[PDB]
Symmetry: C6
Subunit: 219 residues, 6 copies
C-alpha cells in the first residue's frame, strides 16, 4: 500500500503478510459470506492494484467464484475504457500515460506506474477504482454463498425467535438488502414467516414495533 512517510510524501510499502494471512483466514472460515466484503475493504486500505491482486491470489479453492470475480473486474475494465477515450500526444516529464482498464486492474501496469498515479497531483486513484470493481465482484459472488430466497425462511415449530431472526437477516445481507428494505421486511415478512404462536403475538403488537420489542414478546 501507499502510506504517509515522515516528510509528508505518500510512498509505497509492501503488503503485510500478516494482513494477507488474515485475509486467507477469513476466506477459509466464512468463505464468501456477506461479511467477507467489509473485511476485504478494511484489510486493503490504501492498496495498489498489485496489492489487491496479491490478496486475491492467496485465495485457495473457490475456482468458480474467482472466475466470476475476474469477469466483473473485466466488465468494469472494458467500461472504464469506453467512458475514457485515449487522448494522444507526447508525455511530459513528471506526467504519465492515462491508465486503461487493464492498467487499473494491474495486468498491464507496473508497480511504479501504479504509485505514480496514486501519488500524482491530482492523483488518479487506480487502487481505489480497482477496489471498487473488486467489491462489486464480491457482491455478485456472495449471492452464490447465500443465494437469496427470503420466502423460504420460516420459523421452526419449536425454534426460538432469536435464531429465526439471525437466519432472516443473515439471508438479507447475502442478498444485499438496503437498510430501507430491511425495515419493510421486518414489518412484514419477519412477522409472516414466524411460527403460529409468535405470528399472533407479533400481529397483536401492531405495525411499528421495534425488533427488540418483537423479541421480547416472543421469548
Amino acid at each position: 500500500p501507499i502510506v504517509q512517510n515522515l516528510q509528508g510524501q505518500m510512498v509505497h510499502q509492501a503488503i503485510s503478510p500478516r494482513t494477507l494471512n488474515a485475509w486467507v483466514k477469513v476466506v477459509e472460515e466464512k468463505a464468501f459470506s456477506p461479511e467477507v466484503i467489509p473485511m476485504f475493504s478494511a484489510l486493503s486500505e490504501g492498496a495498489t492494484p498489485q496489492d489487491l491482486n496479491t490478496m486475491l491470489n492467496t485465495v485457495g479453492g473457490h475456482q468458480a467464484a474467482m472466475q466470476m470475480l475476474k469477469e466483473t473486474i473485466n466488465e468494469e475494465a472494458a467500461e472504464w475504457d469506453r467512458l475514457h477515450p485515449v487522448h494522444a500526444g507526447p508525455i511530459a516529464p513528471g506526467q504519465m500515460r492515462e491508465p486503461r482498464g487493464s492498467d487499473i486492474a494491474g495486468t498491464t501496469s507496473t508497480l511504479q506506474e501504479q504509485i505514480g498515479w496514486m501519488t500524482h497531483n491530482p492523483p488518479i486513484p487506480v487502487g481505489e477504482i480497482y477496489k471498487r470493481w473488486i467489491i462489486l465482484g464480491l457482491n455478485k459472488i456472495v449471492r452464490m454463498y447465500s443465494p437469496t430466497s427470503i420466502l423460504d425462511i420460516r420459523q421452526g415449530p419449536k425454534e426460538p425467535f432469536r435464531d429465526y431472526v439471525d437466519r432472516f437477516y443473515k439471508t438479507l445481507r447475502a442478498e444485499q438488502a438496503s437498510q430501507e428494505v430491511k425495515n419493510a421486511a421486518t414489518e412484514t415478512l419477519l412477522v409472516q414467516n414466524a411460527n403460529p404462536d409468535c405470528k399472533t403475538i407479533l400481529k397483536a403488537l401492531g405495525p411499528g414495533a421495534t425488533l427488540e420489542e418483537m423479541m421480547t414478546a416472543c421469548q
Copy 2:
C-alpha cells in the same frame, strides 16, 4: 482513530486489523455477554465513525442483534436531529457544516469530515457521540444474551455460597444494575435467595455486613 502525532496535532490513523480481529475474537466467544460492552469501548478509543462501523461490520452472524443495534443507533440519530436544529448560512473557510444524526453515524459523512469535526477547535466529537449510541445499543442487545430474573437466582441445596454469589452478580451486570442497586440487593435479595442454613447465618450477621464477611460466615 485519531491520535496525537509528534508535532502535537491530532491526525488520523487506520484502525488496526489486530484490534478488529481482537474484536472479532470477543464476539466469537462471548457473543454479546455483559463483558462485550467494556471491551468494545476499550478497543475503540479515539475511533471515528468510520472506524466504529468497520468494527461492527466485521461481526458475522447475530443478524437480529445487528438490526436491533442499528435501530437504536437510528433512534439516537433522529433524536440528535430533533435536539439540534440546523442553522442556515454560508460556511467559512476552515469551518464545517453542522453534523446531522446521519453524519455522526457515518452514513452521510466522509472520513475527512469526521476528522475535521473531531479535530476542530472546539471539536465536535462525532466519534465519541456515535460510540455512546452504539454502547446504548449494546446494552439493549445484551439483554437478549442475558435474562433479568434476579428473583430466580436461588442458592442450591448443597451449592457453595461462593458460586451462588457469582450467579447473583453475573445476573445483575446483564441487567445493568447500578452500583447503588447492587448494594441494596446485597443487603436483601442475596440474603433471601440463599439456602436455609446460610440465610440463617446471614440473617444472624445483622444488616450491613460486607460481602467478604458474608462469604466467611457461610464458607
Copy 3:
C-alpha cells in the same frame, strides 16, 4: 496509561488490548491465586483509573470476588475522603479540583481530569493511589482462592518432600506471609506437618538447617 513522549512530556496512551487479553489470560487460568497480584501490578504500570477499570471490567465470572473487590475499593474511597477535607474557593487556570475518593476510583472523574492530576506539577497520582486500593482488594480476594489454615498442609504418606514443599509455600503466599514468617514456619510447621520418616530426619537435622539441606535429607 501515561507515558513519556519525545518532547519529555508525560501524555496519555490507550491501554493495549494485548495487555488486557494477557490479563484476561491470567485470571482465566490462575483465577485469583497469589500470583494474580504481582501480575496485575506488572500489567498496569502507569495506568489511569480508567485503564484500571477497563482491566477489571474484562474479568468474566467471579461475581462474588468482583463485589468484594468493589467494596474494598469503596472503603478505601470513603477513607480517602475522611482524611482529605475539601478546601473551598475558585479554581485557577491551570489548576484542578481536589480529587475525591470517587474521582480516584474513576466513577466521577473524566479521563482528562485523571491525566491532569497524574501529569500536574506536583502531580496527584490518582492512578497509583487507586491501584493501591485495588491490590488491597486483591489481597482480600486471594484469601478466598487459597487456604489460610496452614495447619491443613500435611505431607502425604508417600508424597515426595519436594511436592509437600510447593504446597506449603504456595499456601504461605496466598496468606501473604512476610519473609520473616516464612523463616519461622520453615523451622517449625514445615518440619511438623511432614510425614513420619521425614519428620524424624528433619528433627534429626537440628534447628537451623536450610531448605536445600532439608530436601536433601528427605529425597
Copy 4:
C-alpha cells in the same frame, strides 16, 4: 532486502525471520500449489539474491522440486551469460564488475556486490532478475501434477455445479492456462464435462453466457 532510509538512500536490511517463517508456513500447508507463486513474490519485495536463497533454503522436504527449481535457475543463468558477453578492462572506483549468471543467482557474489548493483545508478537489479528466474521455476514445479489433464474433470452425478467449477479452474491454474484459454474452455469443456441435466441447461443457454449465468441456471 533493500529499502528506502530517511536520507533517501536505498540501504540493505536483513530479511525478516517473520517473513521466512511465513514463507515456511505456506509451503508447509499448500506445498507448491498455484498460490505459492504470488505469495513468494509478495514475500520477497526488494529482496537480494542472498535473501531469495535464504528463503528457498528454509524449505524442508520437496527434494525433487528443489532440484528442478535449481535446474531452471541454472538454465536461466547460462542464458544470461550467453546474452551478455563480458566486456574487458579495469574497473573504476565507484563502478563494479558486470554480473554473471552465477552472480545474479548469488553463488559467486557477495552481499555487498548484490547491494552495489541493486543500488548503483543506473542499478542492475540482480534481485529482480533472479526472482524472475525463481518464479519461472515455481511455474514448472506447480505443474508437478498437470495434464493437459482437463479432459478428466467431469461433474459428478450429484455434484453441485459450484464445486465442479472450482475443480475445473483449479486445474487450469496448475496448467497455467492464460486468460484467453480459460474463456474458450468455459464456452466449451466446462459445458461438455458437466452432468447430463446441467449440460442440457448450459447447452440451452446459448454460446456466450457468463460464468455467473451458468451457475444460476444449474444451481
Copy 5:
C-alpha cells in the same frame, strides 16, 4: 530494563509482557531444568531489580523452590553488606547513596534509585549484581529438578549409543558439570557405562577419541 535511546542516554523501559509471558512459558514446561538458567539470563538483559522481581513473581507453583531461591538471594545480600561497609557523610546533588544488599535485591530501593545507579558514571550495576545472585539461586534449585546421579546412567542392552549420549550429558548439565569435567567424563564414565559391545569398541579406540568418532564406532 535500561536501554539506549536516540540521544545516546541509557533510559528505563517497562518490561515487556511478552517476555514475562515467555518466561512463564518456560517455567510452565521445563520447570527448573538446566535450560531454565540461560533462558532466564537471555530474557533479562539489561533488567533492573524491579524487572527481575516482576519476572520471578509471575512464577506460579514451585513454592519450595521460590523460597530456596529467596534464601540464596538473601545470603548474597548479607554478604554484599559484609564486604561493602557503609561510608558516612552527606550526599551531593547528582550522587546517590551506596546501595545495600536489600537495595540491590529491590526490597528497599525505588525504581528511580535503581536507574540512577545503573545509569550513573561510573554506574553501579545493581541489575547485573542482583541477576548474578538470582542465577546462583537457580543453580541450586535445578539440583532439585535434576539433582544428580551419573553412576546410574548406563547404556541399555539394545539402546542406541546416540540416546545413551543424550542421557549422559543431559545429566551432566543438571549437575552443572564444567566443560573440563565433561572432557574427563567422556574419556572415562561415558566409555565405562556403555553396553558390552560398545564398551569394547570404545576401549579399542584408545584414550582420546572425539565424541563424533565414538558415535561412529558404535552406530
Copy 6:
C-alpha cells in the same frame, strides 16, 4: 548483533528474544535436520560471539549434539591459534589485542572487545569467524540423525518415482552434496537405484534428461 545506526556507525544491539524464540522453535520441531543450518545462519546475521552463544544456550535437550558442537568449535579455536601467532608489544589507544581462538568463541572476550573488533577499521570479524566454526559443527551434527549411504536409497517395488526422488535428494542434503555432485548423481545413481520398470524407461531416455522429464517418463 552489530547494525548500522543513523549516523553511519555500526553499533551493538541486543539479540531479539523473538529471534531466540524462533530459533528455539526450529530446533524444537526439526531438531538438527539439514534445514537447521541455513536457518541458524539466517537468524544470526551480524551476530557477535555473545549473541551466537546466547542462541546456542537456549537449546534444551540434545546434550550429545551440543558437546559434539562444542568440540568442533574448540578444534577450530585451537587451529586459529596455530595459524595466528601472537605478536608482542604494547597496545596503542584505539587499537586492541589480537583475538585468540577462545576470544573469537566468546569464552575469554567481553562484549565490548567483540564490538571493537567487529567494528574496527579494518575490522576483525570475530562474529563471522565464530559463526563459520558453528556451521561446521552443525554440519557434523546433522549427520547424526541422517545417513551418509546413498547406495542404500533404492526405489520400492511399487513406490512412486516422486517419493523415491524426495528420499534421494533428502539424503544428498544431509551429506551436503554440492550442486555439482547432485547433477552427477541424477545422471547416474538416481537412474540406477530406481525400480526395474523405471530404470529401463530412464535408461531409455538417454543421458542428459532433466529431472522433470524423468518424473514424467515414470509417473
